[PDB]
């Protein structure tokens, strides 16, 4: 079986610059090499076939070259919409994808907008309380969220989720969900979400008092 090796694994490049992606086959595939763009939530999109031929509708800023075992894709005038995983694929003898290169768009720093949501009364009927903290439209991806319940620091009862990079503004968003039993939730008053991020002058706390407003 042919082994396709792509490098680098990940890439972080600012809008307007250019990036070159490399693909190697373990044996010669002649010119039967294709490049694909795969945005999260969409089907793969063919960019290049024949090592160097742009597919229909692909702009000239996608440039492919190579022959035999060594191939490159160069993407210039990079835009926020280019945030995706890029794969090569040999089709000289059936088909084999490389492991892909994940391209992140290095926009400027953006601080999170923080929101906290108390459990709905409907959920409390089930015997569980989910407290959700939202960190909206921030960059870079790294952020720390700490939960405080009546000023007591929480640990082990939260779970985080991060969106894929936004194709329009290149930000991320993050949710932290604090899960407690209804009984534990009704024992305390102050539920706080504290957010740390390089775009914030000091850690931001959003909180609510159980049963108010």
């Amino acid at each position: 079986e042919i082994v396709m090796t792509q490098s680098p694994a990940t890439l972080s490049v600012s809008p307007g610059e250019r990036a070159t992606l490399s693909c190697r086959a373990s044996r010669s595939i002649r010119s039967a090499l294709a490049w694909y763009q795969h945005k999260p939530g969409q089907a793969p999109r063919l960019l290049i076939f024949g090592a160097s031929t742009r597919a229909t509708g692909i702009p000239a800023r996608f440039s492919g070259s190579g022959s035999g075992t060594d191939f490159t894709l160069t993407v210039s005038s990079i835009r926020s919409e280019d945030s995706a995983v890029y794969y090569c694929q040999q089709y000289d003898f059936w088909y084999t994808f490389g492991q892909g290169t994940k391209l992140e768009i290095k926009r400027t720093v953006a601080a999170p907008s923080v929101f906290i949501f108390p459990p709905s009364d409907e959920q409390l009927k089930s015997g569980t309380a989910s407290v959700v903290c939202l960190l909206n439209n921030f960059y870079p991806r790294e952020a720390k969220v700490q939960w405080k319940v009546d000023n007591a620091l929480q640990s082990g009862n939260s779970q985080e989720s991060v969106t894929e990079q936004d194709s329009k503004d290149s930000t991320y968003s993050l949710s932290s969900t604090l899960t407690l039993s209804k009984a534990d939730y009704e024992k305390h008053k102050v539920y706080a979400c504290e957010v740390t991020h390089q775009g914030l002058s000091s850690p931001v706390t959003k909180s609510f008092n159980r049963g108010e407003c």
């Binding site: 793969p44 059936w94 994808f97 959920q123 089930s126 991060v162 969106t163 969900t177």
Partner: protein, 216 residues
């Protein structure tokens, strides 16, 4: 437009079997070779199998030889994949795609949306949908909790509201069930005027929920 539509995914026990289908429309199905391509969770695209336009050339990735069988029915404009002796590594989204136009040239620029195959002993469970109620810019959303397996789809106002929407990837809870939230930022002044409804669909358990998110 030109279209490929996969179906047949679902939950199957390890060692079990499943048949996927792929319906083509908008082109001469009989002119094109077809491939199945899968993406396992957290992994890259992997070519699985191909059958040429006239069925004369059929190929399989080594790890599915003897387990999977690809076939086509040109009269029904349909491609099939019989998947036997399912393993955990078969858990994936399964795409169909054209590959070649006859034996003339590689094309492979038409892909489906994928159907999800989950190899698990666990039971199917539909989600509960709870409101994330608002308190210049306001945030609101829906909590889609305790479902299995993946995925669920979330829209807002039946797809009319798209700007500012963030639907988070699901997290696996310690219970073995999945949970996610979908949020949206909206103008704070429109809270009393505009109606906000999340539309949650979990096909594996035939659960469709429309939840109204209102200020408390």
């Amino acid at each position: 437009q030109v279209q490929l539509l996969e179906s047949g995914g679902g939950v199957v026990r390890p060692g079990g079997s499943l048949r996927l289908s792929c319906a083509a429309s908008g082109f001469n199905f009989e002119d094109f070779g077809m491939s199945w391509v899968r993406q396992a969770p957290g992994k890259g695209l992997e070519w699985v199998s191909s059958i040429s336009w006239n069925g004369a050339n059929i190929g399989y990735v080594d790890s599915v030889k003897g387990r999977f069988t690809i076939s086509r029915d040109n009269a029904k404009n349909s491609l099939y994949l019989q998947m036997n002796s399912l393993r955990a590594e078969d858990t994936a989204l399964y795409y169909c795609a054209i590959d070649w136009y006859r034996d003339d040239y590689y094309k492979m620029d038409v892909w489906g949306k994928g159907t999800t195959v989950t190899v698990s002993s666990a039971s199917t469970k539909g989600p509960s949908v709870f409101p994330l109620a608002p308190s210049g810019t306001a945030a609101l959303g829906c909590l889609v909790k305790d479902y299995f397996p993946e995925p669920v789809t979330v829209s807002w106002n039946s797809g009319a509201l798209t700007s500012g929407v963030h639907t988070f990837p699901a997290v696996l809870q310690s219970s073995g069930l999945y949970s996610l939230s979908s949020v949206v930022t909206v103008p704070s002044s429109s809270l009393g005027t505009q109606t906000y409804i999340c539309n949650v669909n979990h096909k594996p358990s035939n659960t469709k929920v429309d939840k109204r998110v209102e200020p408390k």
